[PDB]
Homo-oligomer: A and B are copies of this chain.
């Protein structure tokens, strides 16, 4: 959540709002095999 309020005087008041929401999901699987012979 972020809000900003700007105003100037010598009267052109400016107000802004914005919504940032995000989610990420990730599933990682692996498999490693090895054989040795001495």
Q: How many copies does the complex hold?
A: 2
Contact of A19 with B17 at beta-carbon distance under 8 Å, contacts A28-B30, A30-B28 already known: yes
B residues within 8 A CB of A5?
Answer: 17-18
- State the CA gap A1–B23 with chains docked (Å): 9
Q: Is the interface of A mostly helix, strand, loop or mixed?
A: loop
For chain A, give the interface size range: 20 to 34
Inside 8 A of A1's CB, which chain B residues have their CB? 19, 21-22
The answer to whether A18 touches B4, judged by C-beta atoms less than 8 angstroms apart, is yes
Are B19 and A4 closer than 8 Å at their CB atoms? yes
Chain B neighbourhood of A2, CB < 8 A: 18-22
Give A contacts to B, CB under 8 Å: 1-22, 28, 30
